[PDB]
Ligand binder design. Sequence first.
Ligand SMILES: *[C@@H]1O[C@H](CO)[C@@H](O[C@@H]2O[C@H](CO)[C@@H](O[C@@H]3O[C@H](CO[C@H]4O[C@H](CO)[C@@H](O)[C@H](O)[C@@H]4O)[C@@H](O)[C@H](O[C@H]4O[C@H](CO)[C@@H](O)[C@H](O)[C@@H]4O)[C@@H]3O)[C@H](O)[C@H]2NC(C)=O)[C@H](O)[C@H]1NC(C)=O
Ligand SMILES: *[C@@H]1O[C@H](CO)[C@@H](O[C@@H]2O[C@H](CO)[C@@H](O[C@@H]3O[C@H](CO[C@H]4O[C@H](CO)[C@@H](O)[C@H](O)[C@@H]4O)[C@@H](O)[C@H](O[C@H]4O[C@H](CO)[C@@H](O)[C@H](O)[C@@H]4O)[C@@H]3O)[C@H](O)[C@H]2NC(C)=O)[C@H](O)[C@H]1NC(C)=O
Ligand SMILES: *[C@@H]1O[C@H](CO)[C@@H](O[C@@H]2O[C@H](CO)[C@@H](O[C@@H]3O[C@H](CO[C@H]4O[C@H](CO)[C@@H](O)[C@H](O)[C@@H]4O)[C@@H](O)[C@H](O[C@H]4O[C@H](CO)[C@@H](O)[C@H](O)[C@@H]4O)[C@@H]3O)[C@H](O)[C@H]2NC(C)=O)[C@H](O)[C@H]1NC(C)=O
Ligand SMILES: CC(=O)N[C@@H]1[C@@H](O[C@@H]2O[C@@H](C)[C@@H](O)[C@@H](O)[C@@H]2O)[C@H](O[C@@H]2O[C@H](CO)[C@H](O)[C@H](O[C@]3(C(=O)O)C[C@H](O)[C@@H](NC(C)=O)[C@H]([C@H](O)[C@H](O)CO)O3)[C@H]2O)[C@@H](CO)O[C@H]1O
Ligand SMILES: CC(=O)N[C@@H]1[C@@H](O[C@@H]2O[C@@H](C)[C@@H](O)[C@@H](O)[C@@H]2O)[C@H](O[C@@H]2O[C@H](CO)[C@H](O)[C@H](O[C@]3(C(=O)O)C[C@H](O)[C@@H](NC(C)=O)[C@H]([C@H](O)[C@H](O)CO)O3)[C@H]2O)[C@@H](CO)O[C@H]1O
Ligand SMILES: CC(=O)N[C@@H]1[C@@H](O[C@@H]2O[C@H](C)[C@@H](O)[C@@H](O)[C@@H]2O)[C@H](O[C@@H]2O[C@H](CO)[C@H](O)[C@H](O[C@]3(C(=O)O)C[C@H](O)[C@@H](NC(C)=O)[C@H]([C@H](O)[C@H](O)CO)O3)[C@H]2O)[C@@H](CO)O[C@H]1O
Ligand SMILES: *[C@@H]1O[C@H](CO)[C@@H](O[C@@H]2O[C@H](CO)[C@@H](O[C@@H]3O[C@H](CO)[C@@H](O)[C@H](O)[C@@H]3O)[C@H](O)[C@H]2NC(C)=O)[C@H](O)[C@H]1NC(C)=O
Ligand SMILES: *[C@@H]1O[C@H](CO[C@H]2O[C@@H](C)[C@@H](O)[C@@H](O)[C@@H]2O)[C@@H](O[C@@H]2O[C@H](CO)[C@@H](O)[C@H](O)[C@H]2NC(C)=O)[C@H](O)[C@H]1NC(C)=O
Ligand SMILES: *[C@@H]1O[C@H](CO[C@H]2O[C@@H](C)[C@@H](O)[C@@H](O)[C@@H]2O)[C@@H](O[C@@H]2O[C@H](CO)[C@@H](O)[C@H](O)[C@H]2NC(C)=O)[C@H](O)[C@H]1NC(C)=O
Ligand SMILES: *[C@@H]1O[C@H](CO)[C@@H](O[C@@H]2O[C@H](CO)[C@@H](O)[C@H](O)[C@H]2NC(C)=O)[C@H](O)[C@H]1NC(C)=O
Ligand SMILES: *[C@@H]1O[C@H](CO)[C@@H](O[C@@H]2O[C@H](CO)[C@@H](O)[C@H](O)[C@H]2NC(C)=O)[C@H](O)[C@H]1NC(C)=O
Ligand SMILES: *[C@@H]1O[C@H](CO[C@H]2O[C@@H](C)[C@@H](O)[C@@H](O)[C@@H]2O)[C@@H](O)[C@H](O)[C@H]1NC(C)=O
Ligand SMILES: *[C@@H]1O[C@H](CO)[C@@H](O)[C@H](O)[C@H]1NC(C)=O
Lengths: 325, 320, 325, 171, 172, 172
Amino acid sequence: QNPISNNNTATLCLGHHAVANGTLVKTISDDQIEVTNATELVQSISMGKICNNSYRILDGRNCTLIDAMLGDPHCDVFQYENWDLFIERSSAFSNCYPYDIPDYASLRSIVASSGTLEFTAEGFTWTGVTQNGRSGACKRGSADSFFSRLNWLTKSGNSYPTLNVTMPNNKNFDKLYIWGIHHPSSNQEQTKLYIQESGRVTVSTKRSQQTIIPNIGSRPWVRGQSGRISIYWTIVKPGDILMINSNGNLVAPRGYFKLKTGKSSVMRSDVPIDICVSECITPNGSISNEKPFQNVNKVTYGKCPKYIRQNTLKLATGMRNVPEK
Amino acid sequence: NNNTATLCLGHHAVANGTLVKTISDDQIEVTNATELVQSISMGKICNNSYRILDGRNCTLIDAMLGDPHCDVFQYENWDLFIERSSAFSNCYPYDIPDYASLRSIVASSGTLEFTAEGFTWTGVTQNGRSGACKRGSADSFFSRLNWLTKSGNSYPTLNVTMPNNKNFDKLYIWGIHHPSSNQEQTKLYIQESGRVTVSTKRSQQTIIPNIGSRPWVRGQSGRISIYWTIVKPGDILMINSNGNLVAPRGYFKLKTGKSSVMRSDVPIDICVSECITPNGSISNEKPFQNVNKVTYGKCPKYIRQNTLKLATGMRNVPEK
Amino acid sequence: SQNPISNNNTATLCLGHHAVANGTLVKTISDDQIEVTNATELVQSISMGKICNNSYRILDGRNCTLIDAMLGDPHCDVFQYENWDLFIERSSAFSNCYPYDIPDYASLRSIVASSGTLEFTAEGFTWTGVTQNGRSGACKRGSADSFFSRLNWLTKSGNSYPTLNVTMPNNKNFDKLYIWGIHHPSSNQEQTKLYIQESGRVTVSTKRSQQTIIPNIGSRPWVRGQSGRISIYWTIVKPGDILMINSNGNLVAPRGYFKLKTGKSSVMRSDVPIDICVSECITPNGSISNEKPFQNVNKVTYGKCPKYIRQNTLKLATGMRNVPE
Amino acid sequence: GIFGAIAGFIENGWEGMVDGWYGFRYQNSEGTGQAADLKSTQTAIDQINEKLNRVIERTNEKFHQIEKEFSEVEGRIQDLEKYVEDTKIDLWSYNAELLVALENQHTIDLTDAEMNKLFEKTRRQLRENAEDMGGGCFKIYHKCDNACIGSIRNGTYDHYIYRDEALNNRF
Amino acid sequence: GIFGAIAGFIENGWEGMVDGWYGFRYQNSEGTGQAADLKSTQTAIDQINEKLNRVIERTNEKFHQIEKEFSEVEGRIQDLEKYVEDTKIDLWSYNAELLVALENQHTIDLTDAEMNKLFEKTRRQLRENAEDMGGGCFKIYHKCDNACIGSIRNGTYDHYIYRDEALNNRFQ
Amino acid sequence: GIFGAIAGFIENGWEGMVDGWYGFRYQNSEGTGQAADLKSTQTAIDQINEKLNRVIERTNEKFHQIEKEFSEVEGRIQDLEKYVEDTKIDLWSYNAELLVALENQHTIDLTDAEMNKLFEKTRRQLRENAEDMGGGCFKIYHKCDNACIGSIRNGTYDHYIYRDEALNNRFQ
Ligand SMILES: *[C@@H]1O[C@H](CO)[C@@H](O[C@@H]2O[C@H](CO)[C@@H](O[C@@H]3O[C@H](CO[C@H]4O[C@H](CO)[C@@H](O)[C@H](O)[C@@H]4O)[C@@H](O)[C@H](O[C@H]4O[C@H](CO)[C@@H](O)[C@H](O)[C@@H]4O)[C@@H]3O)[C@H](O)[C@H]2NC(C)=O)[C@H](O)[C@H]1NC(C)=O
Ligand SMILES: *[C@@H]1O[C@H](CO)[C@@H](O[C@@H]2O[C@H](CO)[C@@H](O[C@@H]3O[C@H](CO[C@H]4O[C@H](CO)[C@@H](O)[C@H](O)[C@@H]4O)[C@@H](O)[C@H](O[C@H]4O[C@H](CO)[C@@H](O)[C@H](O)[C@@H]4O)[C@@H]3O)[C@H](O)[C@H]2NC(C)=O)[C@H](O)[C@H]1NC(C)=O
Ligand SMILES: *[C@@H]1O[C@H](CO)[C@@H](O[C@@H]2O[C@H](CO)[C@@H](O[C@@H]3O[C@H](CO[C@H]4O[C@H](CO)[C@@H](O)[C@H](O)[C@@H]4O)[C@@H](O)[C@H](O[C@H]4O[C@H](CO)[C@@H](O)[C@H](O)[C@@H]4O)[C@@H]3O)[C@H](O)[C@H]2NC(C)=O)[C@H](O)[C@H]1NC(C)=O
Ligand SMILES: CC(=O)N[C@@H]1[C@@H](O[C@@H]2O[C@@H](C)[C@@H](O)[C@@H](O)[C@@H]2O)[C@H](O[C@@H]2O[C@H](CO)[C@H](O)[C@H](O[C@]3(C(=O)O)C[C@H](O)[C@@H](NC(C)=O)[C@H]([C@H](O)[C@H](O)CO)O3)[C@H]2O)[C@@H](CO)O[C@H]1O
Ligand SMILES: CC(=O)N[C@@H]1[C@@H](O[C@@H]2O[C@@H](C)[C@@H](O)[C@@H](O)[C@@H]2O)[C@H](O[C@@H]2O[C@H](CO)[C@H](O)[C@H](O[C@]3(C(=O)O)C[C@H](O)[C@@H](NC(C)=O)[C@H]([C@H](O)[C@H](O)CO)O3)[C@H]2O)[C@@H](CO)O[C@H]1O
Ligand SMILES: CC(=O)N[C@@H]1[C@@H](O[C@@H]2O[C@H](C)[C@@H](O)[C@@H](O)[C@@H]2O)[C@H](O[C@@H]2O[C@H](CO)[C@H](O)[C@H](O[C@]3(C(=O)O)C[C@H](O)[C@@H](NC(C)=O)[C@H]([C@H](O)[C@H](O)CO)O3)[C@H]2O)[C@@H](CO)O[C@H]1O
Ligand SMILES: *[C@@H]1O[C@H](CO)[C@@H](O[C@@H]2O[C@H](CO)[C@@H](O[C@@H]3O[C@H](CO)[C@@H](O)[C@H](O)[C@@H]3O)[C@H](O)[C@H]2NC(C)=O)[C@H](O)[C@H]1NC(C)=O
Ligand SMILES: *[C@@H]1O[C@H](CO[C@H]2O[C@@H](C)[C@@H](O)[C@@H](O)[C@@H]2O)[C@@H](O[C@@H]2O[C@H](CO)[C@@H](O)[C@H](O)[C@H]2NC(C)=O)[C@H](O)[C@H]1NC(C)=O
Ligand SMILES: *[C@@H]1O[C@H](CO[C@H]2O[C@@H](C)[C@@H](O)[C@@H](O)[C@@H]2O)[C@@H](O[C@@H]2O[C@H](CO)[C@@H](O)[C@H](O)[C@H]2NC(C)=O)[C@H](O)[C@H]1NC(C)=O
Ligand SMILES: *[C@@H]1O[C@H](CO)[C@@H](O[C@@H]2O[C@H](CO)[C@@H](O)[C@H](O)[C@H]2NC(C)=O)[C@H](O)[C@H]1NC(C)=O
Ligand SMILES: *[C@@H]1O[C@H](CO)[C@@H](O[C@@H]2O[C@H](CO)[C@@H](O)[C@H](O)[C@H]2NC(C)=O)[C@H](O)[C@H]1NC(C)=O
Ligand SMILES: *[C@@H]1O[C@H](CO[C@H]2O[C@@H](C)[C@@H](O)[C@@H](O)[C@@H]2O)[C@@H](O)[C@H](O)[C@H]1NC(C)=O
Ligand SMILES: *[C@@H]1O[C@H](CO)[C@@H](O)[C@H](O)[C@H]1NC(C)=O
């Protein structure tokens, strides 16, 4: 009751700090509660550009990975390339002979993962047939041309004999063989190019085979051609053999691609490639990977935060904030 | 005593508590709890929130092709299509490579909006009919397909073109006919060997007939194979054939939909619900359900457990 | 206090907890490392080294693949009418008959393995106008030339190979599995020698489905003396449904159906020996104990198994914090 | 409980208390009485009420998906579809089981805490004027009518008024 | 620990105590003694005894599944099989890590709480007859033979019998 | 908070404390004063510092995966690709929501606990020389200069030498 504290007494108070401007977080007890400090755990901002200093980034510009492979004339700059990540632009196009690839997606996946377009030419013998067939739909500069990695075979004189060739794999790695079949526009065209009325391609190893018939009919003009080619691949394993038997319509390989078990891939984006630092890439550009989570894109490559729906998650980095007065 | 007082502290309890599970305890009694799993359905599909289409005796495919007993389904659209287990085909015997994919694409689109197109077929007989596909007690055929045959003693190489000048994808359903003998082949189509090539700029499909007897279905030993082609805005459909063509009559409108198809046998009636399972509609009050893994709509998550009790009150400690 | 000898009119009562000399470190939400009185390992990372034969019914494939045993390869004859919970395929297994391929091999293997039996009933087929039981020098059974015990090679009889047209109703109450095939000759001479026709064809049909295959004349890699091949297909006939087979050449007929059950069975690739012990979980590295909730041995498991995780160790405290003296 | 108030140093709960979750019973010179404590009760309810909404989001729409029931036998591609659905269900069934137990452990702990706090708040108010009898009761060592008990209840009890009476009675 | 008993006001554990997790030691006229407290020990063990069984099941029986190792490069569908499996493993690996960390945290928390509860139980019985010295020890300000200690340990201690002696000893 | 210290019996926090998270304020014949407690601050900080690293694996590389965007409708294979990815994303979103909620809950409770523990550590030291005023303050009942407050702060306060004075001021 005495206003002046005693000399024989003292007061001791215990307390904790508080800051002027707190910040709201969520707990198990509270929708919102104010803490002294907190951290953002979700990355929502990308750099707007793809950094090319950590991984080898290859800009495909006007070319799809597949076109670069086959040897589409306007993709000639991509010969023997290798990458960690290949960028396919939306504006990309094809400018050679019209084609399709049954299971296109798989072949793209395989090559993208391999991470290389190393190509060794092999000396196949095509006894008794015309080689290096070309088209006006596939201009190499001024000249009619064809896919650089493919060999369009036709009759010589008045015949097209039964082709039967072999190619053994005496190397320490898997060979990838890209080959195809041609589909003419009419029976008249079929017998004009191949003599036989029913073409036939058989490609085989010791324990596997693929057998294809050509398709005949009128189709829409693509760069002046109603004919088409279908693409096929074959993996020959070390110790195995490659065999090709055909009585017509064969679009022959020129050699093989080296297959690797790599860490590579392919990504679709229209975002510019630029010098900077980053170990994680998305279609929206490189992103920082300090934060455990990211809200930028479900498609990622490299050392990436996990993608989640939420644009923000706040983690308390301090105590409940109870301001003065 | 008058120089003292007693102040006691306490908490409430109930005579009738309920058992819950914690990290510390297998079973512990609390004052009050709540069920987190919906394990009972309404026994019926409610058709008030989503547009629900009863397929009755028809599958989605049969309704699309235009099976006679499915003619009531022409120009329909849905949020959810209900295929009954007792559905049946009743037209020409057919098969479809990648049935599941076509069905899935159509169901998702959520509409059967069809638009006839003037295909000129020079030198062939149109509107071929069958005894397997009776409509009005007479021979007929799929309403959306045009079965072509020889005219006189001729079936000339058909070559037609049909451009997509619209701002959407066109879906074409066409097909090929497989006759049961070589006489049948040459009787209907003249040529010993048939061929159908259907193409756009970005694709091509060529199908050859297989001659031979298949098992007797509604009289017929022949068969028909269905195929589909999507034509994009700016693209162009082309059909080339020298026999065995089962021509389309037009196109279906494809659209990015939030629609699906479901298998069920339960009745459909008016009621309030925003979640649908094969066993009927279910209440979405709870976060989980044990009714069915097949759901559509705003649905609780399916889990293995049939019960999870969430404590909503303190530990219950009844009076001595 | 002090007083060396404590007073009779007072007492001391201390409360405390136990401790062990050798503690063990665990991880919590608060601490990277903290010492507790005891902990248990929750990750199983040691196998038994062998497959236990006592809990589940294990079947050793020895040097036969499940598909060979089903086809009826001579060196697989011991496997006739066998059933299993788990079939073990060995890495050293081989085929010893006519060189073949099965498109979607993966699917047929999985259908049979899951069924869990090789129950095969013969059926009375009528092959009017052809020779039956075609044999090969690449498929030796006993001493004589032989063939897959479950398939029936058909060739020309006399001057002609007539159009085959055979039925077989399923009047039972279970799904029937028919295995059939088609032959690819190496040359044109061989085609007409064996089947007369320039072109073979096989159409197998039920009421609801059909399958047509065309052969493909041509040389494949020399395998056990043969450049020809066979391609194996299957058809499942439902109850009430009916099988039909049509061919004007190249048919490798069925002899009967396999019974199809919805089994709780499988097939696994492993090289470890099978031995006497009781265990309820099986991995390619052998059987493992199932007393721990998690395992790190193999992602491939069968039976009552702990869940596969990437971590090789996880300690769960089974005691209070250990504070030594 | 980790605080050991409920099912601890408080022997049992009261069935006769309907107006609150926590409260007071008393005997003084004016008889006995019972009162409920609202701040404690509200803190409890506020934390418990719709607590799952903090972790589990408001049920969202799902439309076309994948087939989950099969009439035919297909193998590889069907195997995958089955495995995908099975993995999904098993993970969610785990999420559900863990969530409920965590949430329940939390509800038990927080309701025990409120009781412990209510005891401590009272004790501090009484200072040296009362002793803990165990069982969650205080012996109050001074004459203490209903209006004096009221001051304790609403937290305006001034111990300096009774200190000398109390300390006299205690020693 | 959040209660700050173990590795807090209790300095260290007792390796000497083999028949319990929590207990007493005492010194008085009759000598020195030690005894375990079975209630608080049992509560601790019951909560800790295979506490995983409460959220995760022993093992699940699984039969035919998908392939998980491949010899040929196939592409699209193989990609998917690998991805599906990888996702599963990553998710369960996260579940495992979180669960253990949570369970461990909960084990330490609960065992500290027991120590704290037993100390409070004792404080309350003793009333004004005893003072907390720190280290989890009480000075009992009255003659207190083994019989009297026993009464504390079985919760039947009657503070009223000793209050006068106790109070006289405390304030002199 | 479950201990009832922070935003409990301690009314508010001290903005003018920048040298620690917990501490003391005092008044005696030499004036007023403020001092941080570093052991309390440190215990809290260590538990909070990079606390996620204890449950989340150091971000690892992911290379070639499945396709997640499609330009054409394909049906069955694409449905599964889409379903698998949608499933993975939803599960991780849940993990994230729950982890943050739990971690935050833990942060409140542990810092609240430290406050409480520091209080009880001080009470124990003081024995019968001080009373609890409420508001987290102690009234010490003996002459108590800066050097004496210091001995409380660093844990070396000896109650025995002040006891007689303290009991006399408390009870007369
Ligand atoms: C089955 O039916 C299909 C579809 O109708 C036929 O395919 C068409 O065939 C005709 C015949 O040649 C093609 O017509 C040609 O078009 C060329 C390209 O046109 C460009 O420019 C026009 C501008 O109007 C655009 O419409 C178009 O998109 C292109 O940008 C022209 O170069 C040709 O013109 C030339 O015509 C004569 C000779 O025909 C020359 O002497 C002239 O100098 C002139 O340059 C020509 O008109 C048409 O493009 C094809 N369309 C498609 C979609 O393929 C098949 O022929 C038919 N098959 C059978 C067996 O009957
Ligand atoms: C290749 O081999 C196959 C199989 O042998 C042949 O296919 C059979 O073809 C014959 C006709 O050529 C079919 O015969 C018809 O069977 C119908 C079956 O439906 C009945 O099913 C059962 C039969 O017990 C019953 O529940 C009930 O009776 C059903 O009606 C009959 O309905 C038909 O009967 C009608 O015609 C007969 C004349 O034969 C008259 O009595 C009446 O008018 C009656 O309405 C008919 O008999 C047989 O179904 C075919 N079987 C299969 C499995 O397809 C192929 O013909 C052969 N191919 C070649 C090129 O030779
Ligand atoms: C299309 O082109 C392909 C490839 O060029 C041809 O395929 C080859 O055809 C020849 C002749 O038919 C095959 O020759 C055969 O080889 C057998 C195995 O040879 C390998 O293994 C043995 C192991 O002991 C080695 O000695 C040898 O170096 C090889 O590595 C041999 O067993 C046969 O040779 C002879 O064996 C006995 C010896 O006791 C003799 O008595 C016989 O005369 C016998 O001929 C056998 O001739 C060769 O293997 C084929 N290679 C492949 C990869 O298939 C196609 O024939 C061709 N087709 C057409 C239509 O032109
Ligand atoms: C009015 C008319 O019919 N003129 C004849 C030419 O046909 C027409 O004109 C040409 C310029 C094209 O526009 C044709 O589409 C059109 O019908 C005809 O030229 C040849 O036409 C054929 C098809 O009728 C074919 O397109 C030829 O094109 C090449 C090409 O450039 O791609 C020539 C290549 O060397 C050849 N490659 C080979 C054989 O490996 C290809 C190949 O035949 C097709 O890609 C296979 O589908 O075609 C074109 O030269 C000409 C008859 O040869 O006479 C004109 O009077
Ligand atoms: C015992 C006998 O030969 N009876 C003759 C009838 O054939 C028999 O009965 C029919 C229903 C089938 O089961 C036959 O296998 C059986 O032999 C014959 O009926 C006609 O048979 C022919 C067989 O060549 C054919 O199936 C006819 O089918 C139609 C049909 O109903 O669908 C008639 C349609 O007009 C026709 N459509 C066309 C031409 O566009 C179709 C079509 O040709 C096939 O579906 C193509 O695969 O067939 C059937 O009427 C009867 C009349 O000739 O004479 C009996 O003596
Ligand atoms: C050295 C030489 O020129 N020898 C021939 C010999 O040809 C060889 O055949 C053996 C098997 C291989 O080494 C070949 O590379 C080599 O060309 C003739 O043998 C016949 O050759 C046939 C090739 O046209 C067949 O391979 C045939 O094989 C059998 C077999 O062993 O299985 C006989 C069997 O009855 C038959 N099965 C039937 C009818 O059902 C079967 C099939 O016809 C084919 O496999 C179908 O693709 O083949 C073999 O006998 C020999 C016979 O005239 O002549 C020597 O001069
Ligand atoms: C509080 O009281 C209610 C109502 O009396 C209790 O609910 C009852 O609990 C029993 C089991 O404890 C239930 O029995 C079970 O269901 C059926 C009974 O026919 C049987 O098939 C099962 O084997 C099982 O025994 C009973 O259904 C249920 N009654 C009602 C009306 O819901 C509740 O258990 C009490 N809780 C406590 C903690 O005392
Ligand atoms: C805190 O309580 C006191 C006294 O006890 C009261 O408790 C209240 C919760 C309520 O039940 C009340 O009826 C009961 O008396 C309050 O002081 C009393 O206030 C009333 C009028 O409200 C007066 O008539 C009394 O004279 C007075 N008592 C005394 C001894 O003066 C007090 O108002 C209350 N404080 C607050 C802040 O609410
Ligand atoms: C609680 O203990 C008291 C006495 O303390 C005993 O504690 C035991 C653990 C024992 O080993 C020993 O340390 C000590 O004797 C019990 O009261 C005693 O028990 C009987 C009653 O018939 C008599 O023989 C004693 O005279 C009596 N002592 C006193 C002081 O009353 C008591 O029974 C026990 N209570 C319970 C509920 O178990
Ligand atoms: C399957 O193939 C052959 C039998 O044709 C076995 O080969 C024998 O292997 C044993 C030891 O493994 C050795 O005696 C010889 O190397 C082989 N003997 C003969 C006569 O060929 C092979 O072992 C079988 N595989 C398995 C797993 O049993
Ligand atoms: C596992 O499989 C079976 C029973 O499931 C047993 O096979 C016996 O193996 C021994 C080898 O020690 C052989 O001598 C016997 O002939 C086999 N028995 C029969 C009935 O065929 C055996 O228990 C296990 N296999 C082993 C140990 O190899
Ligand atoms: C503990 O304090 C003892 C005395 O109090 C001191 O407080 C400090 C803040 C100091 O700066 C002076 O004001 C006082 O002397 C001191 O003598 C002991 O040395 C201290 N204990 C330890 C272990 O260092
Ligand atoms: C602890 O373990 C080690 C053996 O690794 C041993 O040297 C030491 O003596 C052990 N001590 C006790 C008390 O168990």
